Curated annotation (Swiss-Prot), chain B:
Cross-link Glycyl lysine isopeptide (Lys-Gly) (interchain with G-Cter in ubiquitin): residue positions: 106
Involvement in disease: Neurodevelopmental disorder with hypotonia and variable intellectual and behavioral abnormalities: An autosomal dominant neurodevelopmental disorder characterized by profound infantile-onset hypotonia, developmental delay with poor speech, delayed walking, and impaired intellectual development. Additional variable features include feeding difficulties, dysmorphic features, and visual defects.
Lineage: Eukaryota, Metazoa, Chordata, Craniata, Vertebrata
Protein name per its UniProtKB record: DNA-directed RNA polymerase II subunit RPB1
The organism of origin for this protein: Homo sapiens (Human)
UniProt function note: Catalytic core component of RNA polymerase II (Pol II), a DNA-dependent RNA polymerase which synthesizes mRNA precursors and many functional non-coding RNAs using the four ribonucleoside triphosphates as substrates. Pol II-mediated transcription cycle proceeds through transcription initiation, transcription elongation and transcription termination stages. RNA-dependent RNA polymerase that catalyzes the extension of a non-coding RNA (ncRNA) at the 3'-end using the four ribonucleoside triphosphates as substrates. An internal ncRNA sequence near the 3'-end serves as a template in a single-round Pol II-mediated RNA polymerization reaction. May decrease the stability of ncRNAs that repress Pol II-mediated gene transcription.
Curated annotation (Swiss-Prot), chain C:
Domain of life: Eukaryota
Membership in a protein family: Belongs to the TFIIF alpha subunit family.
Protein modification: Phosphorylated on Ser and other residues by TAF1 and casein kinase II-like kinases.
Organism in which the protein naturally occurs: Homo sapiens (Human)
Residues recorded as bearing Phosphothreonine in the entry: 114
Localization per Swiss-Prot or TrEMBL: Nucleus
Induction and repression of expression: Up-regulated in response to enterovirus 71 (EV71) infection.
Gene: GTF2F1
Name listed for the protein in its UniProt record: General transcription factor IIF subunit 1
Swiss-Prot record, chain E:
Subunit structure: Component of the RNA polymerase II (Pol II) core complex consisting of 12 subunits: a ten-subunit catalytic core composed of POLR2A/RPB1, POLR2B/RPB2, POLR2C/RPB3, POLR2I/RPB9, POLR2J/RPB11, POLR2E/RPABC1, POLR2F/RPABC2, POLR2H/RPABC3, POLR2K/RPABC4 and POLR2L/RPABC5 and a mobile stalk composed of two subunits POLR2D/RPB4 and POLR2G/RPB7, protruding from the core and functioning primarily in transcription initiation. Part of Pol II(G) complex, in which Pol II core associates with an additional subunit POLR2M; unlike conventional Pol II, Pol II(G) functions as a transcriptional repressor.
Signal peptide: none
Record family assignment: Belongs to the RNA polymerase beta chain family.
Lineage: Eukaryota, Metazoa, Chordata, Craniata, Vertebrata
Superkingdom classification of source: Eukaryota
Function according to Swiss-Prot or TrEMBL: Catalytic core component of RNA polymerase II (Pol II), a DNA-dependent RNA polymerase which synthesizes mRNA precursors and many functional non-coding RNAs using the four ribonucleoside triphosphates as substrates. Pol II-mediated transcription cycle proceeds through transcription initiation, transcription elongation and transcription termination stages.
Organism: Homo sapiens
Localization: Nucleus
Protein name as it appears in the record: DNA-directed RNA polymerase II subunit RPB2
From Swiss-Prot, chain G:
N6-acetyllysine, modified sites: 21, 32, 121
Gene3D superfamilies per record: Winged helix-like DNA-binding domain superfamily/Winged helix DNA-binding domain (1.10.10.10)
One CC-aspect GO term: nucleus
Coiled-coil ranges per UniProt: none
Modified residues (Phosphoserine): 126
PANTHER family on file: GENERAL TRANSCRIPTION FACTOR IIF SUBUNIT 2
Species of the source: Homo sapiens
In-chain residues carrying the UniProt-annotated modification N-acetylalanine: 1
Taxonomic placement: Eukaryota, Metazoa, Chordata, Craniata, Vertebrata
Cellular location(s): Nucleus
Name under which the protein is recorded: General transcription factor IIF subunit 2
InterPro entries listed in its UniProt record: TFIIF_beta (IPR003196), TFIIF_beta_HTH (IPR040450), TFIIF_beta_N (IPR040504), TFIIF_interaction (IPR011039), WH-like_DNA-bd_sf (IPR036388), WH_DNA-bd_sf (IPR036390)
Free-text function comment from the UniProt entry: TFIIF is a general transcription initiation factor that binds to RNA polymerase II and helps to recruit it to the initiation complex in collaboration with TFIIB.
Length: 50, 152, 138, 196, 138, 244, 222
RNA sequence: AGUCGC
């Protein structure tokens, strides 16, 4: 992307559906959002346990 | 909790020991405004001048008066802090501050136990305290904090 | 004339071996040194507090004259060389090798605040509470 | 194995509310013997003892390796021998045209007055760093060797490059002051460009 | 083959970038990171380390309680080029032979190779002798 | 290990084509153990000495020879984070220096060279351990690689021509993560072509293929982009778990 | 006059000199010109609001270098000389700094990469080493061990316990230099067996130890 | 220990 691009695509928002497939960038930003979900599961599991 | 630090645009310290010929010729009519203010011990008060400029926008929101701020600071610090202020009839707002001393006792007896730090340097500690500690309408310690909400 | 059009051309010589070592003496421009006002100078290696590695001591005019410290540059060059191009009475150029590069810097004629006394102790007490008087008590 | 990049200064805002900012430089000749050297330049904030300056939030100190006590950066410059305050100011900020930078350093200069020669400054670092030794001069020589060998070793390991170290230490203070003005982004903890 | 003149058709599609990628793996291969580092480690770093700067010298004490004459002997040790032989194994008989990684796994050996270095001994005493130097490969 | 939530666990932005996006364990070590990208490569390290010679000869002034009170305009240049010197014309230097890299007077895989314009700094890196990846070069708003290079690559089936020759044409470059911050990088030849007023025209590199951002195990999984992202991460663990 | 005095005559003339930076190879070529009496010629061409300086190499020595002028305003450069007669003189002030530019930086590089190679070649050996069998031939003993045996086997070995009086004299002679000595030194200076030197030291003297079993003996000074 | 399972 170009520097300073708050427009919805360069910063987050994916246009496509899981059926259409995610463009490369869309794909990677999605993995960032999926990681939050993986990490939170592990961290939350320990703390509630205690 | 609004501190004077939030309201203040800027501060400046000048050496102006002669109000009647102030370092800012444009400031000169306000000195004309104050000559009846303890004219006897202007030979006794300190020559260092503190000058402050205030934001009109902060001043509007807090809907304050310059006399409220002057009365707040004088009350907060005490009689030592000699304040005078500019005319309200301007979009800008500036406050001019000098320090009075203990008058009679300063005759240099032993050596004047202060260790002779410069009075200006004492003035920066005044300005420091003045920014951080002064609490105009800042009735408590709730950080800066608020917001107002309409509930339906 | 040179202001309009000029051309000069001089042969360049290198002597097989100089009769003396050529060194550089550099000053800070901020010190604005003018040798016009120098009349005497002494230049000797500081060595007593412990020779060719040791720093320089530059003493100008009399004892009351300015003193400077000369510090040796690690090497003249690390991958090149520095040469001096000089004008000779025949009308030629003569080129001389640099043997050393020394940095020379100013020192105060008499300052000396000293910490050996209890200045360090005063620091423990230091609330920025004095400045002139300590300089007077010295 | 993934580690933090050597030989490069980066600025951090750690937990300790008394350090406003800090400049870290990990400086080993991994291509030498692989030690470490972790110079810290830390900006102190929040306080001022009493009526000192009504805002201590500019008292820049320096950690050094094998030193039992924090010292202000200015002592190290004195120890490098540049007694001239204009010269130290030249190493710190080669643009003395901006009044704001000049004011930012000034209280750190104000601290410097207690020590005003290289030897005594060396005697300060020696005693603040080592085991007690009333020998004074050895404390100076040992400390001299530490500044020569231990501090920013990637910039050199001898007398003949002692000047080069002075600019680099000064560059960190400059790199730190930029963040302290805030015209400089605070450096990320996990940018991959800053990994090895 | 190119000239950048008669060419007018720079376009090139999917079909072709995979040709470029294939050439990357054909040249490098999937585990070129591990191997390149180890190779550089031998080709450079183990040499660099013995070629350091710690040549050791040793001077035994002499003229105890009395002596006069001329020599407290002095010895110096220096290290030169390093050699590495392909990975060998010695049977209990004592006879070395080449190892092969499959053998190394079945019999539980360690797949390593023997390292040799050139060492020098250098007898520059206080006067009587200086040249007596000998090279070894150990 | 075992009790500490943190941001070095979350996939970071810079891991684009450097480390596989979705190939890190699903246990407590999640995100701390990462897996290298397919195209990723790792610099083996090299002596800075040659670069220092070329710079001093080009026009870099030495530290102790300059006058400190005259450096504000000048750009500081560093080599392996060591502050070697100053320069008054960094743009001709950067252009010339890269040209040397394309011509291989300094090792591609090695030297990283970065300019931070808004700060007037030039950082150069030649230390071991930096993660870098190959990219195509584009020039004057178009790709520099032409199909004639492809015909030599087809020819490799009976010729000595190779990926190294391809690097020798200077049509591909190696880019570490620090340098990747300052490039303007087109996703695919298609996009770099259609462009007129569509987005920008300042590109400097292009992606040899975007699906290369995946690491080894993630590449087995077909249509990974039609899947929900953590779904891809469970497959990367299980694929590694299967037998055969 | 003395060697610590710095001659200001040069400075007093206000003599100016030129400062030129040059690549090592050009000066190395000059370095092997030795004393030919020249290395080239300098040409200066001046026009309106512009000056061009250049250098040409000697054609004999070759078996155009443009000059770039440099600022000197930020440093007060001067030159001094350290004579072989141990005399010091301030020779002049730098009025100009300059840089000698190559005729071509680009092709040169081919030579340069080769040039770098010639100064810079530690051919890390590495050429492996195939297979060696020099884990050393095992003699009957170390060669030097035999040297040690030969030395031991030359006269020295047994000692001259006979003649107590001469040995008594030697102790007296020890007492002529210092009040106490280490027994290790006493056997060295006497060349006698320890058990015997003790037997004598019990007879005519005493002992005195210090710190950690560090002992000295004395012939009872009085 | 680390890897790993849920």
């Amino acid at each position: 992307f170009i520097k300073d691009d708050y427009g919805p695509e360069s910063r987050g928002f994916v246009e496509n559906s899981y059926l259409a497939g995610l463009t490369p960038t869309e794909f990677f930003f999605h993995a960032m959002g999926g990681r939050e979900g993986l990490i939170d599961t592990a961290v939350k599991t320990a703390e509630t346990g205690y | 909790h609004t501190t004077l630090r939030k309201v203040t645009a800027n501060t400046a310290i000048y050496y102006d020991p002669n109000p009647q010929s102030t370092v800012v010729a444009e400031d000169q009519e306000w000195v004309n405004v104050y000559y009846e203010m303890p004219d006897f011990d202007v030979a006794r008060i300190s020559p260092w001048l503190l000058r402050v400029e205030l934001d009109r926008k902060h001043m509007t929101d807090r809907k304050l008066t310059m006399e409220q701020i002057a009365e707040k600071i004088n009350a907060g610090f005490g009689d030592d802090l000699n304040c005078i202020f500019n005319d309200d009839n301007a979009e800008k707002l500036v406050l001019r501050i000098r320090i009075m001393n203990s008058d009679e006792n300063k005759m240099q007896e032993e050596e004047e136990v202060v260790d002779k730090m410069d009075d200006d340097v004492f003035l920066r500690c005044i300005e420091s305290n003045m920014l951080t500690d002064m609490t105009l309408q800042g009735i408590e310690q709730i950080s800066k904090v608020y917001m107002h909400l309409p509930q339906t | 004339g040179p202001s309009s059009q000029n051309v000069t051309e001089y042969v360049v010589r290198v002597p097989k071996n100089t009769t003396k070592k050529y060194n550089i003496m550099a000053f800070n421009a901020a010190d604005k040194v003018n040798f016009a006002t120098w009349n005497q100078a002494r230049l000797e290696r500081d060595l007593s507090n412990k020779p060719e590695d040791q720093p320089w001591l530059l003493r100008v005019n009399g004892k009351s004259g300015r003193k400077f410290k000369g510090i040796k540059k690690g090497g003249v060059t690390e991958n090149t060389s520095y040469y001096i191009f000089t004008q000779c009475p025949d009308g030629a150029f003569e080129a001389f090798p640099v043997h050393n590069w020394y940095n020379f810097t100013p020192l105060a004629r008499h300052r000396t605040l000293t910490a050996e006394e209890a200045e360090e102790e005063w620091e423990r007490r230091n609330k920025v509470l004095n400045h002139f008087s300590i300089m007077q008590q010295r | 194995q993934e580690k933090m990049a050597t030989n490069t200064v980066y600025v951090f805002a750690k937990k300790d509310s008394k350090y406003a900012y800090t400049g870290e430089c990990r400086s080993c000749l991994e291509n030498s013997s692989r030690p470490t050297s972790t110079i810290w330049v830390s900006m102190l904030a929040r306080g001022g003892q009493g009526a000192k300056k009504s805002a201590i939030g500019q008292r820049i100190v320096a950690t050094l390796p094998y030193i039992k006590q924090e010292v202000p950066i200015i002592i190290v410059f004195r120890a490098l021998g540049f007694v001239s305050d204009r010269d130290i100011l030249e190493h710190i900020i080669y643009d003395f045209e901006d009044p704001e930078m000049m004011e930012m350093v000034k209280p750190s200069l104000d601290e410097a007055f207690v020590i005003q020669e290289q030897n005594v400054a060396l005697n300060f670092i020696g005693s603040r760093g080592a085991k007690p030794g009333v020998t004074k001069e050895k404390r100076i020589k040992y400390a001299k060797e530490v500044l020569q060998k231990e501090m920013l070793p990637h910039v050199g390991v001898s007398d003949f490059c002692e000047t080069k170290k002075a600019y680099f230490l000064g560059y960190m203070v400059h790199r730190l002051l930029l963040a302290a003005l805030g015209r400089r982004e605070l450096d990320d903890r996990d940018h991959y460009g800053n990994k090895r | 083959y190119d000239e950048d003149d008669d060419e007018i058709t720079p376009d090139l599609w999917q079909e072709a970038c995979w040709i470029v990628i294939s050439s990357y793996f054909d040249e490098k291969g999937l585990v070129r990171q591990q191997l390149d580092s180890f190779d550089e480690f031998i080709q450079m770093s183990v040499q660099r380390i013995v070629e350091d700067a710690p040549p050791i010298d040793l001077q035994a004490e002499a003229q105890h309680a009395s002596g006069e004459v001329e020599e407290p002997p002095r010895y110096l040790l220096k290290f030169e080029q390093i050699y590495l032989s392909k990975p060998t194994h010695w049977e209990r008989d004592g006879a070395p032979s080449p190892m092969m990684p499959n053998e190394a796994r079945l019999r539980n050996l360690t797949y390593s190779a023997p390292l040799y270095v050139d060492i020098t001994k250098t007898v520059i005493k206080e006067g009587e002798e200086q040249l007596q130097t000998q090279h070894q490969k150990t | 290990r075992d009790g500490k939530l943190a941001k070095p666990r979350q996939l970071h932005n810079t891991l684009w084509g450097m480390v596989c996006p979705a190939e890190t364990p699903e246990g407590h070590a999640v995100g701390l153990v990462k897996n290298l990208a397919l195209m990723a490569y790792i610099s083996v390290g090299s002596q800075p000495s040659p670069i220092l010679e070329f710079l001093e000869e080009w026009s870099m002034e030495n530290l102790e020879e300059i006058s400190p009170a005259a450096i504000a305009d000048a750009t500081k240049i560093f080599v392996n984070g060591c502050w070697v010197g100053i320069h008054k014309d960094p743009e001709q230097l950067m252009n010339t220096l890269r040209k040397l890299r394309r011509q291989m007077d300094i090792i591609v895989s090695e030297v990283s060279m970065i300019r931070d314009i808004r700060e007037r700094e030039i950082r150069i890196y030649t230390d071991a351990g930096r993660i870098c990846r190959p990219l195509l070069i584009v020039e004057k708003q178009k790709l520099l690689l032409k199909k004639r290079h492809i015909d030599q690559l087809k020819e490799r089936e009976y010729n000595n021509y190779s990926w190294q020759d391809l690097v020798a044409s200077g049509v591909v470059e190696y880019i570490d993560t620090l340098e990747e911050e300052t490039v303007m990088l087109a996703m695919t030849p298609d996009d770099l072509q259609e462009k007129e007023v569509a987005y920008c025209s300042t590109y400097t590199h292009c992606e040899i293929h975007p699906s290369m951002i995946l690491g080894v195990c993630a590449s087995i999984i077909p249509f990974p982009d039609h899947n929900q992202s953590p779904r891809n991460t469970y497959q990367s663990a299980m694929g590694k778990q299967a037998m055969g | 006059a003395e060697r610590g005095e710095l001659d200001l005559t040069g400075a007093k003339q206000n003599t100016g000199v030129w400062l030129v930076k040059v690549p090592k190879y050009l000066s190395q070529q000059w370095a092997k010109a030795s004393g030919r009496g020249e290395v080239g010629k300098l040409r200066i061409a001046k026009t309106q609001g512009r000056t061009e300086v250049s250098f040409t190499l000697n054609e004999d020595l070759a078996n155009e270098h443009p000059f770039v002028l440099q600022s000197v305003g930020g440093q007060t450069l001067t030159v001094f000389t350290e004579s072989s007669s141990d005399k010091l003189s301030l020779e002049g002030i730098v009025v100009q700094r300059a840089e000698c530019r190559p005729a071509a930086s680009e092709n040169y590089m081919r030579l340069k990469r080769l040039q770098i190679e010639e100064s810079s070649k530690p051919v890390r050996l590495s050429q492996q080493l195939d297979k060696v069998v020099t884990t050393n031939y095992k003699p009957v003993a170390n060669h030097q061990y035999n040297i040690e045996y030969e030395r031991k086997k030359k006269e020295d070995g047994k000692r001259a316990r006979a003649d107590k009086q001469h040995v008594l004299d030697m102790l007296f002679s020890a007492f002529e230099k210092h009040q106490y000595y280490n027994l290790k030194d006493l056997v060295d200076i006497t060349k006698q067996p320890v058990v015997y030197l003790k037997e004598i030291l019990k007879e005519i003297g005493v002992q005195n130890v210090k710190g950690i079993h560090k002992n000295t003996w004395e012939l009872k000074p009085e």
